[PDB]
Amino acid sequence: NLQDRFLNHLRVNKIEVKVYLVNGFQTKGFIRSFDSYTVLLESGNQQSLIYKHAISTIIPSSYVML
Amino acid sequence: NLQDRFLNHLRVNKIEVKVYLVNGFQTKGFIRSFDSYTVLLESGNQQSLIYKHAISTIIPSSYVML
Amino acid sequence: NLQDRFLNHLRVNKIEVKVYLVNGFQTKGFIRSFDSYTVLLESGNQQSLIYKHAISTIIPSSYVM
Amino acid sequence: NLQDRFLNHLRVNKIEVKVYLVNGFQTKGFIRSFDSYTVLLESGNQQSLIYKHAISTIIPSSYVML
Amino acid sequence: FNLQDRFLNHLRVNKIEVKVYLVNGFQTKGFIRSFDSYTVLLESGNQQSLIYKHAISTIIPSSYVM
Amino acid sequence: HMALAEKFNLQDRFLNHLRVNKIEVKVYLVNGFQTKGFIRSFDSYTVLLESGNQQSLIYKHAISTIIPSSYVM
RNA sequence: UUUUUU
Numbered sequence: 001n002l003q004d005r006f007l008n009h010l011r012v013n014k015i016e017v018k019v020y021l022v023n024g025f026q027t028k029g030f031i032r033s034f035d036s037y038t039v040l041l042e043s044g045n046q047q048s049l050i051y052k053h054a055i056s057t058i059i060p061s062s063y064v065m066l
Numbered sequence: 067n068l069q070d071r072f073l074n075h076l077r078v079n080k081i082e083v084k085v086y087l088v089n090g091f092q093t094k095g096f097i098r099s100f101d102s103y104t105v106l107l108e109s110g111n112q113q114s115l116i117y118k119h120a121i122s123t124i125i126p127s128s129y130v131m132l
Numbered sequence: 133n134l135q136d137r138f139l140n141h142l143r144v145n146k147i148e149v150k151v152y153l154v155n156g157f158q159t160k161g162f163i164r165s166f167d168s169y170t171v172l173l174e175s176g177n178q179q180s181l182i183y184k185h186a187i188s189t190i191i192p193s194s195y196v197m
Numbered sequence: 198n199l200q201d202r203f204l205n206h207l208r209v210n211k212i213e214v215k216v217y218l219v220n221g222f223q224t225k226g227f228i229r230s231f232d233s234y235t236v237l238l239e240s241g242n243q244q245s246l247i248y249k250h251a252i253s254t255i256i257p258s259s260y261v262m263l
Numbered sequence: 264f265n266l267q268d269r270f271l272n273h274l275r276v277n278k279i280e281v282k283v284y285l286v287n288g289f290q291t292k293g294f295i296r297s298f299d300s301y302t303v304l305l306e307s308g309n310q311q312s313l314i315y316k317h318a319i320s321t322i323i324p325s326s327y328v329m
Numbered sequence: 330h331m332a333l334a335e336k337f338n339l340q341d342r343f344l345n346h347l348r349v350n351k352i353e354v355k356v357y358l359v360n361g362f363q364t365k366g367f368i369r370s371f372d373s374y375t376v377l378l379e380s381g382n383q384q385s386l387i388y389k390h391a392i393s394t395i396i397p398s399s400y401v402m
Numbered sequence: 403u404u405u406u407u408u
Binding site for chain 2: 059
């Protein structure tokens with residue numbers, strides 16, 4: 001399925017993303033890990049466990065070919 | 067049924083859509099694929115993985131008949 | 133059950149509806165079609181595929197039984 | 198279970214309710230019926246079909262009990 | 264182990280007052296008369312509110328629990 | 330004899346790490362609001378956040394982001 | 403707690 005193949009690609013290849021949340025904030029960093037309900041997004045120093053339901057859209061810094 | 071016939075129609079025939087997010091923002095693009103939970107939009111060589119729970123409306127640019 | 137009978141009553145009597153979305157905005161059209169998760173709303177040649185999870189209220193122009 | 202015992206008690210007895218929506222709007226009326234996902238709310242000629250995921254609070258006109 | 268129902272049941276049967284915070288920014292203070300899987304009945308005087316759990320962001324008790 | 334399987338549950342593993350090592354977290358709510366505290370407990374739908382005297386039963390569906398005070402592992 | 407009630 002699309003979601004987890006897209007996400008793993010961004011994980012293994014360490015592509016940097018912008019993550020827009022439904023409340024309106026945004027954050028960037030690298031998807032270190034993810035499960036069914038959360039994404040762990042690290043930005044060098046800082047970690048953010050992010051709930052998928054709060055994510056609006058993930059936008060990669062470089063083109064993902066699957 | 068309806069939802070997947072409609073998205074596939076927009077994907078096969080490469081019709082451009084406006085997607086309206088539940089937090090007021092909006093995006094233009096082409097549906098390049100989709101699963102249960104997400105829609106992969108594309109415009110200007112840029113990609114947006116978009117969670118369906120964040121979409122309120124999809125408005126095709128051209129009339130779709132099923 | 134209540135929702136499909138209500139939705140379908142509006143599909144086949146071609147009753148116009150206002151559709152209030154959870155986020156404040158508001159549409160208006162005819163229910164062309166629907167399924168578990170979406171509603172196909174048409175006004176003229178404009179189609180809106182609308183996610184139910186994003187729908188607050190559906191208010192018909194007429195009365196429904 | 199509480200939700201449907203409560204809703205159906207207000208349906209039969211014809212107790213007026215205020216309905217507070219997640220978006221901050223508020224309807225007032227009578228629950229003519231309901232299923233697992235919506236509430237059919239009526240006051241006069243006016244007929245609101247309301248999605249439960251959109252409702253925050255229902256507030257009766259009169260104490261309800263069992 | 265069920266954190267939610269044990270916490271809510273403790274509030275219910277020791278009649279602790281709570282402040283219930285809604286995702287839309289409203290708030291409401293009362294006692295938990297009752298709850299099932301989707302809703303909470305919050306009573307204050309002869310006022311009753313059926314609250315949908317999907318609209319609650321937080322419950323803050325005015326006493327301490329255990 | 331070997332044990333059986335997993336899988337990777339990232340959510341529980343990260344929360345339980347925060348809970349037992351008493352790492353202060355900042356919690357962002359989907360309505361924009363935020364709060365601080367220590368995870369005392371959690372289940373499928375809720376997290377118990379204690380800060381001093383205050384206890385908060387926060388619903389997960391209302392949580393946007395959890396930022397810990399220290400790096401996790 | 404990822405597309406119609408935690």
